[PDB]
Amino acid sequence: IETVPVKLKPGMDGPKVKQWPLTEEKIKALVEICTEMEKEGKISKIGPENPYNTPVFAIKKSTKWRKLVDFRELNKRTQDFWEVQLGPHPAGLKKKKSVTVLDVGDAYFSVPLDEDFRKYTAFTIPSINNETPGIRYQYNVLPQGWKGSPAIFQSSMTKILEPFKKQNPDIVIYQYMDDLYVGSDLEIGQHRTKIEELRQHLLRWGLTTPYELHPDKWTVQPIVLPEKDSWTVNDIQKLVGKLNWASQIYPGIKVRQLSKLLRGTKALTEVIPLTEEAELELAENREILKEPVHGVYYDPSKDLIAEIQKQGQGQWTYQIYQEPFKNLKTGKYARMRHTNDVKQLTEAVQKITTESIVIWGKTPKFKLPIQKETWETWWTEYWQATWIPEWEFVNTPPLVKLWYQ
Amino acid sequence: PISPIETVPVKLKPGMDGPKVKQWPLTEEKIKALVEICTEMEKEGKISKIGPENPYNTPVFAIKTKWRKLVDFRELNKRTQDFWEVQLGIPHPAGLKKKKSVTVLDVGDAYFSVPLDEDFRKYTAFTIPSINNETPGIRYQYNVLPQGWKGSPAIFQSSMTKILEPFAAQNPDIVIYQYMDDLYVGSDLEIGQHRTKIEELRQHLLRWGLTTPDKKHQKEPPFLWMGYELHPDKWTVQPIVLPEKDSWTVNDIQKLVGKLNWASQIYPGIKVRQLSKLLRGTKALTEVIPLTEEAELELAENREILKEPVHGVYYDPSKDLIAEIQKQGQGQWTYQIYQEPFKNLKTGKYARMRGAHTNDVKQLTEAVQKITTESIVIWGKTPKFKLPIQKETWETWWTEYWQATWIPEWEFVNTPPLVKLWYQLEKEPIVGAETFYVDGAANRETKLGKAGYVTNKGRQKVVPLTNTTNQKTELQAIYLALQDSGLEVNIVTDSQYALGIIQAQPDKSESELVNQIIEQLIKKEKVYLAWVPAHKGIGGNEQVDKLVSA
Ligand SMILES: C=CC(=O)N(C)CCOc1cc(Cl)ccc1Oc1cccc2cc(C#N)ccc12
Ligand SMILES: [Mg+2]
Ligand SMILES: [Mg+2]
Ligand SMILES: [Mg+2]
């Protein structure tokens, strides 16, 4: 009933981001959703004296349209409030064998928002062909997607969960945005049961809830060298190039014995027997790549970065790092195709972002291999998460596709 | 007439106070004009005479037959809060739905018909000068939205939306667009009752204080609107006039690409690429820019097309939306959108390179993207595409392309020029083809350099190069190996720069060298291009390096 005061950082004005144009089908969906949110008191119409704006999108998490607000700009502009002033990430969640994600964002609509801050939540439902000024609303309650909402609701969440963490001391519960991450070491069937108890405990305390992960299996992919029956000059040149690249990372790699096999000016297609010294050197280089890198630590103050490469045939490689060549994690995502490139990239971005949330508690900045406007047009057609990471668009063609392959 | 509409509250930007700009003195005729305008405005409640305690002022002037009062709100506008930006875009004629009847109402004195927040009126104070400051001047303030104040467009539109809502509620047949101080009303009623519904809306607005033009006094078709001509069955742009000049300034060229851009939304085939290249010398808008031969040809071709007249049709939501694209050459593209085969909603162009080197399929996909974004804005959906490229061509490209790409539903239309891959690099080295180890180098100071090769058949060569960079020489080495090889060649380079540019498989470039390489790659049958790290003694590569360095 009483509201928590909320402030923006020093000398920071609210968000003024532009609403992206939408298909008639997404607009009609937004107008229905908002017409009902207005009847329930959750949002109210606003007048021209509010200049603020945050973009909104319609997506599907099912057959029922859902509304998603891009509070990325408002989040940067409140961040001291929800990063310093309020809310903590546990290191053991990546270790559990099962982790289930529970959407608990509907709990926020039970809590009024500071009347002096509501103007900063303004958003616009666009019209087609600029026929009419968009429909303009702001929020009366805590909105999904604002980093303030979990921070304001934290105390209530601790009270509702405290019974359950009593009964189950070895189960880990981490909150990020509108979701709860619940990790056990239990057998799967026991795990889903422990999850069901928590849902029922949540529901009977007035918190409606509508995805299971296994961080045990994640890892950093070791670099893999080919194994051929007959090598040509081209295969040795590729092999020497890849190993040359890998030695910015692993120091012990040697190429002397391998490149000796190429002394002279030889035809690319010429079969070169792998001498014994060369073969032993290659064999040693395969063992060096088995180990991991040495001095690669997560710094919580620095941004996480995810690069992604298209490998064709539905495979995408990714690396997460904070400083170049110093990968905290690397991976390859696969798609059992009826699929397309944007569905695949969009899906990969959500996996990487979840993985990043579980491991470090924040989302990485993506370097996406796609044309900006193509991304801006189709990303909602497959987006199901309720958060939105930062991204930029790399237009330089990675020639390192082959290496991370 | 002033409105019993509620007022929007208004604040100055935090920590700012109201303007105090002194009133410049005026001629006794201008001073008499303002006294008579202000008393007529006082009578209608639009302004009120204020005491002496108001500390604010904004200069006022007069001009002309009918004199008009004008106020300089620059200083107050700098001090008032920001508002929700009023509509920037405007409706596009190709998006208007066909309607049997359409009416245009101009709201008169629109801003002066709307009340202004009470607490904010003090900051509008102005002053009519007394002759030779003999006595004090007359202090006035506004009670309605001033003309030229920052808030007026947004609060007037806000007020007009609210006013219309009750009338729209009890008339779900009529369609009302608002734009500036106009309303455009469309229906499919019998022109008689449509004249009736118009008369009702007029009276509804007249009750809220909004005067509207007497029927048989309201504009008639075709409407000159934001550079358009709107006929009841068709639309087109207003006539375009491209100057003839012996010399051209930067400013003259901007005005020229401007009008052509405008023309291209309905005149198929407009081109501006060679013209806009001229303006890469963005400088003083006065700097005279000598014209290119390609710019002369472009502009001439444009005048040819502007000679015949063209029109677009309006939109019918039940019919499909369709986009067709044709190549224009030299990297320029043209497209039409339509529902019925020769009745275009609109047309447009696309010429961007967005990079030094590209190829046709990438540009076609970019063109499909620009159309997709435009269709959503204008109609709220994406069209079906008819495109001059076969599925095999596009599938092969988008599958090998490192970047992610969305392929709409489209159909092959067989209308040359078709879009094709002029060449394709080999994916595997070529047996029985000579292997060229290439390299180049230049002195970063003298800018002199050399390109050469060393092959497996024992051939070697070095060519001298003047005023070049390490990067250009590395492509020059590749060009040399193409020139001196048979129809199949394996080339090996240590240049990531040069590899990247060729692996991307361009068919068009800004580089004369790269265009030459492209010509060579087309004439070959099989080319394999391979990379090795420099200065690692690979062999082949080591010998060209020693060669080219000596
Ligand atoms: C005249 C023929 C025509 O447009 N037709 C048959 C169909 C589309 O038009 C409309 C359709 C509707 Cl549902 C409402 C208003 C319309 O008309 C205008 C829509 C937007 C801006 C306008 C600007 C002016 C001026 N000046 C006049 C009319 C406008
Ligand atoms: Mg918005
Ligand atoms: Mg460009
Ligand atoms: Mg070199």
From Swiss-Prot, chain B:
The record marks 397, 410 as: Essential for RT p66/p51 heterodimerization. Changing residue 181 to A: Strongly decreased RNA-directed and DNA-directed DNA polymerase activities. No effect on RNase H activity. Changing residue 433 to I: Replication slightly delayed. Changing residue 179 to F: 70% loss of polymerase activity. No loss of polymerase activity. Mg(2+) 2 binds at residues 439, 474, 494, 545. Changing residue 402 to L: Decreased RT p66/p51 heterodimerization. Changing residue 227 to A: Complete loss of RNA-dependent DNA polymerase activity. Complete loss of RNA 5'-end and 3'-end cleavages. A motif (Tryptophan repeat motif) lies at residues 394-410. Changing residue 436 to A: Virions contain primarily p51 RT. Changing residue 70 to V: No loss of polymerase activity. No loss of RNase H activity. It catalyses: Endohydrolysis of RNA in RNA/DNA hybrids. Three different cleavage modes: 1. sequence-specific internal cleavage of RNA. Human immunodeficiency virus type 1 and Moloney murine leukemia virus enzymes prefer to cleave the RNA strand one nucleotide away from the RNA-DNA junction. 2. RNA 5'-end directed cleavage 13-19 nucleotides from the RNA end. 3. DNA 3'-end directed cleavage 15-20 nucleotides away from the primer terminus; DNA(n) + a 2'-deoxyribonucleoside 5'-triphosphate = DNA(n+1) + diphosphate. RT is structured in five subdomains: finger, palm, thumb, connection and RNase H. Within the palm subdomain, the 'primer grip' region is thought to be involved in the positioning of the primer terminus for accommodating the incoming nucleotide. The RNase H domain stabilizes the association of RT with primer-template. The tryptophan repeat motif is involved in RT p66/p51 dimerization. This is Reverse transcriptase/ribonuclease H. It comes from Human immunodeficiency virus type 1 group M subtype B (isolate BH10). The chain holds residues 600 to 1153 of 1447 of the full protein.
